[PDB]
Protein backbone atom coordinates (compact mmCIF):
# COMPACT_ATOMS: atom_id res chain seq x y z
CA UNK A 1 0.00 0.00 0.00
CA UNK A 2 2.90 2.37 1.12
CA UNK A 3 4.54 1.85 -1.99
CA UNK A 4 1.88 1.54 -4.62
CA UNK A 5 0.41 5.80 -2.71
CA UNK A 6 3.77 6.69 -3.28
CA UNK A 7 4.21 5.73 -7.40
CA UNK A 8 0.33 7.78 -7.62
CA UNK A 9 -0.83 10.89 -6.69
CA UNK A 10 -4.28 12.25 -5.01
CA UNK A 11 -6.29 15.36 -5.55
CA UNK A 12 -8.76 16.04 -3.05
CA UNK A 13 -11.05 19.23 -3.94
CA UNK A 14 -13.80 19.39 -1.13
CA UNK A 15 -17.46 20.66 -1.56
CA UNK A 16 -16.83 24.00 0.03
CA UNK A 17 -14.28 25.01 -2.83
CA UNK A 18 -16.28 26.86 -5.91
CA UNK A 19 -13.99 23.56 -8.13
CA UNK A 20 -16.88 21.27 -7.58
CA UNK A 21 -19.55 21.68 -9.07
CA UNK A 22 -16.95 23.22 -12.43
CA UNK A 23 -15.37 19.28 -12.09
CA UNK A 24 -18.58 17.41 -11.83
CA UNK A 25 -20.37 19.14 -14.92
CA UNK A 26 -17.11 18.78 -16.70
CA UNK A 27 -16.96 14.98 -16.02
CA UNK A 28 -20.46 14.38 -17.05
CA UNK A 29 -19.42 15.66 -20.79
CA UNK A 30 -16.04 13.46 -20.91
CA UNK A 31 -16.98 11.03 -23.90
CA UNK A 32 -14.83 7.97 -22.18
CA UNK A 33 -15.36 6.86 -18.89
CA UNK A 34 -17.78 4.82 -16.70
CA UNK A 35 -19.74 6.22 -14.46
CA UNK A 36 -21.98 3.18 -12.99
CA UNK A 37 -23.62 5.84 -10.45
CA UNK A 38 -25.62 8.94 -11.09
CA UNK A 39 -27.00 11.71 -8.99
CA UNK A 40 -29.57 14.47 -10.10
CA UNK A 41 -29.06 18.01 -9.90
CA UNK A 42 -32.53 19.77 -10.84
CA UNK A 43 -32.75 23.44 -10.87
CA UNK A 44 -35.65 25.30 -10.50
CA UNK A 45 -37.05 28.63 -11.49
CA UNK A 46 -40.34 29.72 -10.25
CA UNK A 47 -40.54 33.30 -11.52
CA UNK A 48 -43.35 35.80 -9.92
CA UNK A 49 -46.10 33.89 -12.14
CA UNK A 50 -46.88 30.39 -11.40
CA UNK A 51 -45.20 29.69 -14.70
CA UNK A 52 -42.18 27.17 -14.19
CA UNK A 53 -38.48 26.94 -15.50
CA UNK A 54 -36.66 23.74 -14.66
CA UNK A 55 -33.99 21.25 -15.73
CA UNK A 56 -32.32 17.95 -14.42
CA UNK A 57 -29.23 17.05 -15.26
CA UNK A 58 -27.20 13.89 -13.96
CA UNK A 59 -23.71 13.65 -12.56
CA UNK A 60 -21.44 11.21 -11.54
CA UNK A 61 -22.70 11.15 -8.08
CA UNK A 62 -21.06 9.26 -4.41
CA UNK A 63 -19.31 6.34 -4.99
CA UNK A 64 -16.58 5.62 -7.23
CA UNK A 65 -16.12 5.80 -11.23
CA UNK A 66 -13.39 5.37 -13.52
CA UNK A 67 -12.12 7.92 -16.31
CA UNK A 68 -9.34 7.94 -19.32
CA UNK A 69 -8.47 11.09 -19.99
CA UNK A 70 -5.09 11.14 -22.38
CA UNK A 71 -4.09 7.32 -21.49
CA UNK A 72 -4.53 8.06 -17.58
CA UNK A 73 -7.07 5.84 -16.03
CA UNK A 74 -7.92 7.76 -13.65
CA UNK A 75 -10.01 6.53 -10.52
CA UNK A 76 -12.38 9.26 -8.84
CA UNK A 77 -14.44 8.79 -5.61
CA UNK A 78 -17.08 11.02 -4.28
CA UNK A 79 -17.90 10.57 -0.90
CA UNK A 80 -20.10 12.08 1.50
CA UNK A 81 -19.96 12.44 5.52
CA UNK A 82 -22.52 10.78 7.64
CA UNK A 83 -22.08 13.65 10.24
CA UNK A 84 -20.87 16.76 9.55
CA UNK A 85 -23.19 19.87 7.47
CA UNK A 86 -22.35 22.41 6.01
CA UNK A 87 -24.11 25.75 6.59
CA UNK A 88 -23.50 27.33 3.26
CA UNK A 89 -25.74 25.07 0.82
CA UNK A 90 -27.14 23.56 4.14
CA UNK A 91 -25.94 19.70 2.79
CA UNK A 92 -23.69 17.07 4.21
CA UNK A 93 -19.94 17.58 3.57
CA UNK A 94 -18.75 16.07 0.22
CA UNK A 95 -15.56 15.21 -0.99
CA UNK A 96 -14.07 14.33 -4.61
CA UNK A 97 -10.83 12.39 -4.93
CA UNK A 98 -8.98 11.73 -8.36
CA UNK A 99 -6.41 9.42 -7.99
CA UNK A 100 -3.51 8.48 -10.74
CA UNK A 101 -0.04 7.50 -10.76
CA UNK A 102 2.58 10.38 -9.84
CA UNK A 103 4.04 10.47 -13.43
CA UNK A 104 1.45 11.81 -14.87
CA UNK A 105 0.42 14.68 -11.53
CA UNK A 106 1.08 17.31 -14.40
CA UNK A 107 -2.31 16.65 -16.25
CA UNK A 108 -4.76 17.84 -13.10
CA UNK A 109 -3.99 21.08 -13.49
CA UNK A 110 -4.66 20.63 -17.77
CA UNK A 111 -8.12 18.87 -16.28
CA UNK A 112 -9.32 21.24 -13.72
CA UNK A 113 -8.05 24.25 -16.53
CA UNK A 114 -10.55 22.45 -18.88
CA UNK A 115 -13.13 22.19 -16.57
CA UNK A 116 -12.71 25.96 -15.81
CA UNK A 117 -12.62 26.35 -19.33
CA UNK A 118 -16.51 24.84 -19.25
CA UNK A 119 -17.03 27.46 -16.48
CA UNK A 120 -15.36 30.56 -17.93
CA UNK A 121 -17.48 30.45 -20.74
CA UNK A 122 -19.20 33.34 -19.46
CA UNK A 123 -18.13 35.91 -21.44
CA UNK A 124 -20.34 38.95 -20.24
CA UNK A 125 -18.69 42.05 -21.46
CA UNK A 126 -20.78 44.53 -20.09
CA UNK A 127 -20.31 48.02 -17.65
CA UNK A 128 -22.62 48.22 -14.43
CA UNK A 129 -24.06 51.34 -13.41
CA UNK A 130 -23.60 53.04 -10.13
CA UNK A 131 -25.14 55.56 -8.61
CA UNK A 132 -25.71 57.97 -5.81
CA UNK A 133 -27.71 56.88 -2.86
CA UNK A 134 -27.46 59.58 -0.18
CA UNK A 135 -23.52 59.27 0.46
CA UNK A 136 -23.53 55.94 -0.57
CA UNK A 137 -22.93 54.54 -4.35
CA UNK A 138 -25.91 52.02 -5.16
CA UNK A 139 -25.85 49.37 -8.37
CA UNK A 140 -28.34 50.44 -10.80
CA UNK A 141 -29.63 49.52 -14.17
CA UNK A 142 -29.10 45.64 -14.52
CA UNK A 143 -25.44 45.38 -16.20
CA UNK A 144 -26.24 45.64 -19.69
CA UNK A 145 -23.71 44.97 -22.32
CA UNK A 146 -21.10 47.99 -23.21
CA UNK A 147 -22.22 49.61 -26.27
CA UNK A 148 -19.41 49.13 -29.32
CA UNK A 149 -16.37 51.71 -29.66
CA UNK A 150 -17.75 52.13 -33.17
CA UNK A 151 -21.62 52.86 -32.20
CA UNK A 152 -19.78 56.65 -31.59
CA UNK A 153 -19.47 58.97 -34.09
CA UNK A 154 -17.75 62.37 -33.35
CA UNK A 155 -15.48 64.72 -35.48
CA UNK A 156 -13.01 63.69 -37.42
CA UNK A 157 -10.20 63.97 -34.81
CA UNK A 158 -11.83 64.10 -31.58
CA UNK A 159 -12.10 60.37 -31.48
CA UNK A 160 -8.21 60.25 -31.59
CA UNK A 161 -7.21 62.58 -29.11
CA UNK A 162 -9.52 61.44 -26.34
CA UNK A 163 -8.21 57.89 -26.94
CA UNK A 164 -4.29 58.67 -26.88
CA UNK A 165 -4.91 60.75 -23.89
CA UNK A 166 -6.20 58.61 -21.62
CA UNK A 167 -4.07 55.35 -22.76
CA UNK A 168 -0.81 57.96 -21.90
CA UNK A 169 -2.74 58.57 -18.74
CA UNK A 170 -2.69 54.97 -18.19
CA UNK A 171 0.97 54.42 -18.47
CA UNK A 172 2.32 57.18 -16.65
CA UNK A 173 2.20 55.86 -13.06
CA UNK A 174 5.95 56.20 -11.90
CA UNK A 175 6.19 59.40 -14.06
CA UNK A 176 3.26 60.46 -11.33
CA UNK A 177 4.73 58.70 -8.42
CA UNK A 178 7.98 60.23 -8.69
CA UNK A 179 6.92 63.72 -8.65
CA UNK A 180 4.69 63.45 -5.67
CA UNK A 181 1.59 64.77 -7.91
CA UNK A 182 -1.59 62.51 -7.53
CA UNK A 183 -2.27 60.07 -10.34
CA UNK A 184 -5.72 61.51 -11.37
CA UNK A 185 -6.97 63.44 -14.51
CA UNK A 186 -9.90 65.29 -15.26
CA UNK A 187 -12.06 66.00 -18.88
CA UNK A 188 -14.41 68.95 -19.97
CA UNK A 189 -16.11 67.27 -22.86
CA UNK A 190 -18.59 70.60 -23.98
CA UNK A 191 -20.83 71.24 -26.34
CA UNK A 192 -24.75 71.41 -27.51
CA UNK A 193 -27.02 68.94 -25.93
CA UNK A 194 -27.68 65.44 -28.40
CA UNK A 195 -24.07 65.56 -29.37
CA UNK A 196 -23.33 62.00 -29.03
CA UNK A 197 -21.15 62.75 -25.36
CA UNK A 198 -22.65 60.29 -22.92
CA UNK A 199 -22.52 57.53 -26.19
CA UNK A 200 -18.58 58.36 -26.18
CA UNK A 201 -18.66 58.06 -22.25
CA UNK A 202 -20.14 55.30 -22.36
CA UNK A 203 -17.81 53.40 -25.41
CA UNK A 204 -15.13 54.97 -23.88
CA UNK A 205 -15.51 53.21 -20.62
CA UNK A 206 -16.19 49.69 -22.36
CA UNK A 207 -12.91 50.52 -24.02
CA UNK A 208 -11.15 49.77 -20.44
CA UNK A 209 -14.18 47.93 -18.58
CA UNK A 210 -14.76 50.40 -15.88
CA UNK A 211 -17.73 51.41 -14.45
CA UNK A 212 -19.40 54.68 -14.65
CA UNK A 213 -20.06 55.99 -11.23
CA UNK A 214 -22.65 58.42 -12.80
CA UNK A 215 -23.53 61.88 -10.72
CA UNK A 216 -25.68 64.25 -11.97
CA UNK A 217 -26.41 67.91 -9.52
CA UNK A 218 -25.15 68.06 -0.74
CA UNK A 219 -21.65 69.49 -0.62
CA UNK A 220 -20.45 67.69 2.32
CA UNK A 221 -21.80 64.09 1.15
CA UNK A 222 -20.22 65.11 -2.15
CA UNK A 223 -16.38 64.81 -1.13
CA UNK A 224 -17.54 61.44 0.38
CA UNK A 225 -19.11 60.47 -3.20
CA UNK A 226 -16.14 61.80 -5.12
CA UNK A 227 -13.74 59.87 -2.78
CA UNK A 228 -15.96 56.39 -2.37
CA UNK A 229 -15.77 55.10 -5.94
CA UNK A 230 -15.84 51.53 -6.22
CA UNK A 231 -12.87 49.66 -7.81
CA UNK A 232 -11.96 49.98 -11.54
CA UNK A 233 -14.69 53.12 -12.32
CA UNK A 234 -14.67 56.11 -14.40
CA UNK A 235 -16.46 59.00 -12.70
CA UNK A 236 -19.06 61.16 -14.56
CA UNK A 237 -20.19 64.64 -13.43
CA UNK A 238 -23.14 65.64 -15.60
CA UNK A 239 -24.17 68.89 -15.70
CA UNK A 240 -21.07 70.66 -13.83
CA UNK A 241 -22.56 74.24 -14.88
CA UNK A 242 -25.23 73.95 -12.42
CA UNK A 243 -23.21 75.18 -9.53
CA UNK A 244 -22.02 74.49 -4.88
CA UNK A 245 -18.92 75.94 -6.30
CA UNK A 246 -16.44 76.11 -3.31
CA UNK A 247 -17.02 72.74 -1.84
CA UNK A 248 -17.03 71.05 -5.70
CA UNK A 249 -13.47 72.52 -6.37
CA UNK A 250 -12.44 71.46 -2.27
CA UNK A 251 -14.08 67.73 -3.39
CA UNK A 252 -11.80 67.45 -6.32
CA UNK A 253 -8.74 68.70 -5.05
CA UNK A 254 -7.86 69.21 -1.44
CA UNK A 255 -5.42 66.29 0.72
CA UNK A 256 -8.58 64.29 0.45
CA UNK A 257 -9.74 62.71 -2.62
CA UNK A 258 -8.72 59.26 -4.44
CA UNK A 259 -5.62 57.47 -5.91
CA UNK A 260 -6.54 56.90 -9.32
CA UNK A 261 -9.60 58.63 -10.43
CA UNK A 262 -10.41 59.84 -13.90
CA UNK A 263 -13.43 62.01 -14.09
CA UNK A 264 -14.64 63.22 -17.09
CA UNK A 265 -17.00 66.34 -17.05
CA UNK A 266 -20.07 67.17 -19.09
CA UNK A 267 -21.77 70.97 -20.12
CA UNK A 268 -24.29 71.84 -22.23
CA UNK A 269 -22.54 75.61 -22.25
CA UNK A 270 -18.82 76.29 -20.01
CA UNK A 271 -19.76 79.58 -19.36
CA UNK A 272 -10.31 78.96 -12.26
CA UNK A 273 -11.63 75.43 -12.77
CA UNK A 274 -9.38 74.74 -15.92
CA UNK A 275 -5.78 74.34 -13.73
CA UNK A 276 -3.76 71.28 -14.17
CA UNK A 277 -4.92 68.36 -11.16
CA UNK A 278 -8.83 70.16 -11.80
CA UNK A 279 -9.63 70.06 -15.55
CA UNK A 280 -7.09 69.79 -18.10
CA UNK A 281 -8.52 68.10 -21.58
CA UNK A 282 -11.19 70.06 -22.54
CA UNK A 283 -12.61 69.50 -26.16
CA UNK A 284 -15.99 71.11 -28.17
CA UNK A 285 -17.92 68.17 -30.15
CA UNK A 286 -20.73 69.83 -31.31
CA UNK A 287 -23.12 69.84 -34.60
CA UNK A 288 -23.52 66.86 -37.31
CA UNK A 289 -20.60 67.61 -39.88
CA UNK A 290 -20.38 66.52 -43.46
CA UNK A 291 -18.06 63.99 -41.92
CA UNK A 292 -20.05 62.97 -39.08
CA UNK A 293 -23.42 62.72 -41.49
CA UNK A 294 -21.27 60.42 -44.49
CA UNK A 295 -20.16 58.29 -41.49
CA UNK A 296 -23.40 57.96 -40.03
CA UNK A 297 -25.03 56.93 -43.08
CA UNK A 298 -22.26 54.45 -44.08
CA UNK A 299 -22.95 53.39 -40.42
CA UNK A 300 -26.12 52.43 -40.92
CA UNK A 301 -26.22 50.76 -44.54
CA UNK A 302 -23.27 49.22 -45.70
CA UNK A 303 -22.13 49.24 -49.63
CA UNK A 304 -24.39 51.88 -51.05
CA UNK A 305 -21.84 54.38 -51.90
CA UNK A 306 -24.17 56.33 -54.66
CA UNK A 307 -26.69 57.31 -52.06
CA UNK A 308 -24.12 58.91 -49.70
CA UNK A 309 -23.44 61.79 -51.92
CA UNK A 310 -27.25 62.69 -52.96
CA UNK A 311 -28.06 62.78 -49.06
CA UNK A 312 -24.75 65.34 -48.13
CA UNK A 313 -26.03 67.58 -51.18
CA UNK A 314 -29.61 67.23 -49.65
CA UNK A 315 -28.70 67.83 -46.05
CA UNK A 316 -26.26 70.83 -46.94
CA UNK A 317 -29.33 72.79 -46.97
CA UNK A 318 -32.41 73.42 -44.36
CA UNK A 319 -29.54 72.64 -41.51
CA UNK A 320 -29.77 75.01 -38.51
CA UNK A 321 -28.96 72.80 -35.34
CA UNK A 322 -28.88 69.56 -37.33
CA UNK A 323 -27.19 66.73 -34.44
CA UNK A 324 -26.44 63.49 -34.71
CA UNK A 325 -29.70 62.73 -32.34
CA UNK A 326 -31.73 63.73 -34.73
CA UNK A 327 -29.86 62.27 -37.28
CA UNK A 328 -30.07 58.95 -35.56
CA UNK A 329 -33.96 59.75 -34.90
CA UNK A 330 -34.61 60.24 -38.37
CA UNK A 331 -32.74 56.76 -39.68
CA UNK A 332 -33.88 54.40 -37.00
CA UNK A 333 -37.39 55.34 -38.71
CA UNK A 334 -36.64 54.52 -42.06
CA UNK A 335 -34.39 51.10 -41.89
CA UNK A 336 -33.36 49.20 -44.57
CA UNK A 337 -34.61 51.41 -46.71
CA UNK A 338 -32.56 54.21 -47.56
CA UNK A 339 -35.06 55.66 -50.25
CA UNK A 340 -37.76 56.63 -47.77
CA UNK A 341 -34.61 58.66 -45.71
CA UNK A 342 -33.56 60.49 -48.81
CA UNK A 343 -37.35 62.35 -48.87
CA UNK A 344 -37.98 62.01 -44.76
CA UNK A 345 -35.27 62.99 -43.41
CA UNK A 346 -33.98 65.96 -46.31
CA UNK A 347 -37.75 67.86 -44.99
CA UNK A 348 -37.17 68.28 -41.24
CA UNK B 1 -62.89 44.48 -30.08
CA UNK B 2 -61.49 47.60 -31.58
CA UNK B 3 -61.47 48.96 -35.19
CA UNK B 4 -60.39 46.80 -38.78
CA UNK B 5 -56.40 47.60 -38.66
CA UNK B 6 -55.78 48.67 -35.03
CA UNK B 7 -55.79 44.88 -34.03
CA UNK B 8 -52.93 44.16 -36.89
CA UNK B 9 -51.14 47.41 -36.83
CA UNK B 10 -50.10 47.25 -33.24
CA UNK B 11 -49.69 43.11 -32.76
CA UNK B 12 -47.28 43.14 -35.81
CA UNK B 13 -45.12 46.12 -34.80
CA UNK B 14 -44.36 44.66 -31.54
CA UNK B 15 -43.59 41.21 -33.23
CA UNK B 16 -41.14 43.26 -35.60
CA UNK B 17 -39.14 44.77 -32.24
CA UNK B 18 -38.89 41.66 -31.04
CA UNK B 19 -37.16 40.19 -33.89
CA UNK B 20 -34.64 43.37 -34.55
CA UNK B 21 -32.22 42.54 -31.67
CA UNK B 22 -29.01 42.21 -33.85
CA UNK B 23 -30.39 45.47 -36.17
CA UNK B 24 -30.62 47.36 -33.08
CA UNK B 25 -27.61 46.07 -31.23
CA UNK B 26 -24.89 47.04 -33.83
CA UNK B 27 -26.23 50.43 -34.29
CA UNK B 28 -25.23 50.81 -30.96
CA UNK B 29 -29.15 52.05 -30.25
CA UNK B 30 -31.00 51.15 -26.95
CA UNK B 31 -33.38 48.65 -26.97
CA UNK B 32 -36.69 49.95 -26.39
CA UNK B 33 -39.76 51.14 -28.03
CA UNK B 34 -42.76 53.50 -26.87
CA UNK B 35 -46.30 53.37 -27.69
CA UNK B 36 -49.02 55.84 -27.49
CA UNK B 37 -52.53 54.54 -26.95
CA UNK B 38 -54.69 57.60 -27.53
CA UNK B 39 -58.49 58.36 -27.39
CA UNK B 40 -61.68 58.88 -25.49
CA UNK B 41 -61.95 57.19 -22.05
CA UNK B 42 -63.44 54.18 -22.30
CA UNK B 43 -62.52 53.08 -25.72
CA UNK B 44 -60.96 49.99 -24.62
CA UNK B 45 -57.17 50.71 -24.51
CA UNK B 46 -56.33 49.25 -21.47
CA UNK B 47 -57.88 45.95 -22.13
CA UNK B 48 -56.62 45.92 -25.40
CA UNK B 49 -52.88 45.94 -23.51
CA UNK B 50 -53.73 43.57 -20.96
CA UNK B 51 -54.54 41.40 -23.97
CA UNK B 52 -51.16 41.80 -25.64
CA UNK B 53 -49.58 41.46 -22.40
CA UNK B 54 -51.31 38.14 -22.13
CA UNK B 55 -50.10 37.26 -26.04
CA UNK B 56 -46.90 38.27 -25.02
CA UNK B 57 -47.08 36.33 -21.30
CA UNK B 58 -45.32 39.53 -19.77
CA UNK B 59 -46.23 41.48 -16.52
CA UNK B 60 -48.23 44.63 -16.50
CA UNK B 61 -45.41 46.90 -14.63
CA UNK B 62 -48.36 49.47 -14.15
CA UNK B 63 -47.53 53.15 -12.80
CA UNK B 64 -50.20 56.04 -12.83
CA UNK B 65 -49.73 59.49 -12.57
CA UNK B 66 -42.03 62.00 -7.08
CA UNK B 67 -39.56 62.71 -10.08
CA UNK B 68 -36.39 61.44 -8.53
CA UNK B 69 -37.67 57.94 -8.11
CA UNK B 70 -39.43 57.64 -11.46
CA UNK B 71 -36.48 57.02 -13.07
CA UNK B 72 -35.49 54.62 -10.16
CA UNK B 73 -39.34 52.69 -10.93
CA UNK B 74 -38.23 53.01 -15.27
CA UNK B 75 -35.25 51.24 -14.48
CA UNK B 76 -36.27 48.80 -11.82
CA UNK B 77 -38.99 46.50 -13.77
CA UNK B 78 -38.91 42.74 -13.03
CA UNK B 79 -37.85 40.38 -15.26
CA UNK B 80 -40.47 39.66 -18.73
CA UNK B 81 -42.21 42.90 -18.20
CA UNK B 82 -44.23 45.58 -20.16
CA UNK B 83 -44.54 48.82 -18.58
CA UNK B 84 -47.88 50.94 -18.75
CA UNK B 85 -47.64 54.90 -17.83
CA UNK B 86 -51.33 55.88 -17.32
CA UNK B 87 -52.25 59.27 -17.75
CA UNK B 88 -49.10 60.98 -19.50
CA UNK B 89 -50.90 64.07 -20.00
CA UNK B 90 -50.63 65.06 -16.40
CA UNK B 91 -47.14 66.48 -16.11
CA UNK B 92 -43.01 66.69 -13.68
CA UNK B 93 -42.06 67.11 -17.82
CA UNK B 94 -38.42 67.53 -17.84
CA UNK B 95 -37.60 64.81 -15.20
CA UNK B 96 -40.15 62.50 -17.11
CA UNK B 97 -38.33 63.59 -20.73
CA UNK B 98 -35.46 62.69 -18.61
CA UNK B 99 -36.46 59.13 -16.98
CA UNK B 100 -37.24 57.88 -20.39
CA UNK B 101 -34.38 58.28 -22.36
CA UNK B 102 -30.99 59.40 -20.48
CA UNK B 103 -28.26 56.68 -20.37
CA UNK B 104 -29.76 55.62 -17.16
CA UNK B 105 -32.61 53.55 -18.30
CA UNK B 106 -33.28 49.43 -18.71
CA UNK B 107 -32.13 47.58 -21.62
CA UNK B 108 -35.28 45.90 -23.24
CA UNK B 109 -38.30 48.08 -21.97
CA UNK B 110 -41.79 48.16 -24.16
CA UNK B 111 -44.03 51.24 -22.36
CA UNK B 112 -47.21 51.95 -23.94
CA UNK B 113 -48.55 55.08 -23.07
CA UNK B 114 -52.54 56.18 -22.90
CA UNK B 115 -54.16 59.58 -22.26
CA UNK B 116 -57.35 60.62 -22.63
CA UNK B 117 -56.47 64.00 -24.76
CA UNK B 118 -52.93 63.68 -26.58
CA UNK B 119 -52.77 67.70 -26.36
CA UNK B 120 -40.81 66.98 -28.42
CA UNK B 121 -42.05 63.84 -26.71
CA UNK B 122 -42.85 62.43 -30.14
CA UNK B 123 -39.20 61.96 -30.91
CA UNK B 124 -37.94 58.49 -31.60
CA UNK B 125 -36.28 56.80 -28.76
CA UNK B 126 -39.25 57.88 -26.79
CA UNK B 127 -43.04 57.87 -28.17
CA UNK C 1 7.63 4.46 21.32
CA UNK C 2 8.33 6.26 24.54
CA UNK C 3 11.83 6.44 23.72
CA UNK C 4 11.58 7.79 20.10
CA UNK C 5 9.11 10.54 20.84
CA UNK C 6 11.94 11.85 23.90
CA UNK C 7 14.68 11.82 21.46
CA UNK C 8 12.06 13.82 18.47
CA UNK C 9 9.63 17.04 18.73
CA UNK C 10 6.84 17.54 17.42
CA UNK C 11 4.53 20.94 16.95
CA UNK C 12 0.98 20.80 15.80
CA UNK C 13 -0.05 24.01 14.36
CA UNK C 14 -4.12 24.01 14.14
CA UNK C 15 -6.48 25.94 11.70
CA UNK C 16 -7.39 28.30 13.97
CA UNK C 17 -4.24 29.80 13.61
CA UNK C 18 -2.94 32.66 11.35
CA UNK C 19 0.33 30.79 11.08
CA UNK C 20 -1.37 27.30 9.15
CA UNK C 21 -2.32 29.05 5.74
CA UNK C 22 1.14 30.64 5.58
CA UNK C 23 2.75 27.49 6.47
CA UNK C 24 1.26 25.38 3.65
CA UNK C 25 2.14 27.88 1.66
CA UNK C 26 5.49 27.95 2.85
CA UNK C 27 5.61 24.12 1.98
CA UNK C 28 4.41 24.59 -1.26
CA UNK C 29 7.30 26.49 -2.74
CA UNK C 30 10.17 24.26 -0.89
CA UNK C 31 11.88 22.44 -3.65
CA UNK C 32 12.83 19.62 -1.88
CA UNK C 33 10.61 17.07 -0.66
CA UNK C 34 8.01 14.26 -0.87
CA UNK C 35 4.25 15.26 -0.94
CA UNK C 36 2.50 12.56 -2.50
CA UNK C 37 -1.39 13.75 -1.50
CA UNK C 38 -2.44 17.55 -2.61
CA UNK C 39 -5.30 19.93 -2.01
CA UNK C 40 -6.79 22.71 -4.04
CA UNK C 41 -7.51 25.71 -3.05
CA UNK C 42 -9.84 28.38 -5.31
CA UNK C 43 -9.46 31.95 -4.60
CA UNK C 44 -12.99 33.35 -7.20
CA UNK C 45 -13.42 36.94 -7.32
CA UNK C 46 -17.06 37.61 -9.12
CA UNK C 47 -16.88 41.73 -9.09
CA UNK C 48 -19.85 43.52 -9.95
CA UNK C 49 -19.98 42.72 -13.54
CA UNK C 50 -19.98 39.21 -14.10
CA UNK C 51 -15.91 39.27 -14.66
CA UNK C 52 -14.29 36.45 -12.75
CA UNK C 53 -10.68 36.76 -11.39
CA UNK C 54 -9.85 33.22 -10.19
CA UNK C 55 -7.06 31.11 -9.36
CA UNK C 56 -5.60 27.67 -8.43
CA UNK C 57 -3.09 26.36 -6.11
CA UNK C 58 -2.16 23.03 -5.10
CA UNK C 59 -1.16 22.64 -1.53
CA UNK C 60 0.06 19.18 0.50
CA UNK C 61 -3.71 18.43 1.82
CA UNK C 62 -4.79 15.71 4.52
CA UNK C 63 -2.42 12.82 4.68
CA UNK C 64 1.31 13.07 5.76
CA UNK C 65 4.34 13.81 3.47
CA UNK C 66 7.98 14.39 3.94
CA UNK C 67 10.44 17.03 3.66
CA UNK C 68 14.53 18.04 3.86
CA UNK C 69 14.94 21.14 5.31
CA UNK C 70 18.79 21.36 6.52
CA UNK C 71 19.15 17.79 6.94
CA UNK C 72 16.81 16.94 8.76
CA UNK C 73 13.82 14.86 7.49
CA UNK C 74 10.84 16.32 9.19
CA UNK C 75 7.53 14.51 9.05
CA UNK C 76 4.87 16.01 8.29
CA UNK C 77 1.10 14.67 8.47
CA UNK C 78 -2.23 16.94 7.95
CA UNK C 79 -5.25 15.89 9.46
CA UNK C 80 -9.47 16.68 9.84
CA UNK C 81 -11.45 16.05 12.29
CA UNK C 82 -14.55 13.91 11.23
CA UNK C 83 -17.11 15.56 14.03
CA UNK C 84 -16.06 19.14 15.21
CA UNK C 85 -16.86 21.92 13.06
CA UNK C 86 -15.37 25.26 12.99
CA UNK C 87 -17.85 28.73 12.59
CA UNK C 88 -14.70 30.89 12.33
CA UNK C 89 -14.35 29.08 8.47
CA UNK C 90 -17.32 26.77 8.57
CA UNK C 91 -14.96 23.99 7.89
CA UNK C 92 -14.32 20.46 9.99
CA UNK C 93 -11.17 21.37 12.52
CA UNK C 94 -7.91 20.88 10.80
CA UNK C 95 -4.42 20.22 12.49
CA UNK C 96 -1.10 20.00 10.68
CA UNK C 97 1.76 17.95 12.87
CA UNK C 98 5.92 17.90 12.41
CA UNK C 99 7.77 15.79 13.88
CA UNK C 100 11.68 15.75 13.63
CA UNK C 101 14.51 14.65 16.01
CA UNK C 102 14.72 16.69 19.32
CA UNK C 103 18.00 18.15 18.70
CA UNK C 104 16.95 19.58 15.96
CA UNK C 105 14.22 22.15 17.45
CA UNK C 106 16.01 24.88 17.23
CA UNK C 107 15.00 24.46 13.30
CA UNK C 108 11.08 25.51 13.53
CA UNK C 109 11.38 28.92 14.50
CA UNK C 110 13.74 29.24 11.57
CA UNK C 111 11.02 27.33 9.33
CA UNK C 112 8.40 29.22 10.45
CA UNK C 113 10.24 32.99 10.20
CA UNK C 114 10.69 31.77 6.36
CA UNK C 115 6.75 30.93 6.43
CA UNK C 116 6.65 34.64 8.01
CA UNK C 117 8.80 36.12 5.53
CA UNK C 118 6.84 34.61 2.44
CA UNK C 119 3.66 36.29 4.60
CA UNK C 120 5.37 39.37 5.24
CA UNK C 121 6.13 40.48 1.55
CA UNK C 122 2.84 43.31 2.60
CA UNK C 123 4.81 45.98 2.27
CA UNK C 124 2.05 48.47 1.72
CA UNK C 125 3.42 51.61 3.40
CA UNK C 126 0.49 53.72 3.69
CA UNK C 127 -1.27 56.65 4.96
CA UNK C 128 -4.92 55.93 6.27
CA UNK C 129 -6.83 59.29 6.36
CA UNK C 130 -9.98 59.52 8.93
CA UNK C 131 -12.54 61.76 9.28
CA UNK C 132 -15.21 62.68 11.05
CA UNK C 133 -18.80 61.50 11.08
CA UNK C 134 -20.91 62.74 13.61
CA UNK C 135 -19.27 62.67 16.62
CA UNK C 136 -17.14 59.54 15.91
CA UNK C 137 -14.16 58.82 12.96
CA UNK C 138 -14.41 56.76 10.39
CA UNK C 139 -12.02 55.88 7.38
CA UNK C 140 -12.22 57.68 3.75
CA UNK C 141 -10.52 57.62 1.22
CA UNK C 142 -9.14 53.65 0.60
CA UNK C 143 -5.33 53.35 2.27
CA UNK C 144 -3.54 55.23 -0.63
CA UNK C 145 0.82 54.99 -0.52
CA UNK C 146 1.95 57.43 2.12
CA UNK C 147 3.34 60.59 -0.18
CA UNK C 148 7.26 60.59 -0.43
CA UNK C 149 9.26 63.51 2.20
CA UNK C 150 11.13 65.02 -1.26
CA UNK C 151 8.36 65.76 -3.12
CA UNK C 152 7.20 68.29 -0.80
Request: net charge positive; charged share 25%.
Amino acid sequence: RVLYRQMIVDLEIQSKDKSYAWFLTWMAKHPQRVSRHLSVRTNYIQHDNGSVSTKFSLVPGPGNHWIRYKGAFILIKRERSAKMIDIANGSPFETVTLTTLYRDKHLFDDILNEAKDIALKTTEGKTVIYTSFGPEWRKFGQPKAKRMLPSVILDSGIKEGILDDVYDFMKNGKWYSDRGIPYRRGYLLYGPPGSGKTSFIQALAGELDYNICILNLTDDRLNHLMNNMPERSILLLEDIDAATFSGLLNALDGVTSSEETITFMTTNHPEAIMRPGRIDYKVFVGNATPYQVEKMFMKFYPGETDICKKFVNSVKELDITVSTAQLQGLFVMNKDAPHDALKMVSSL
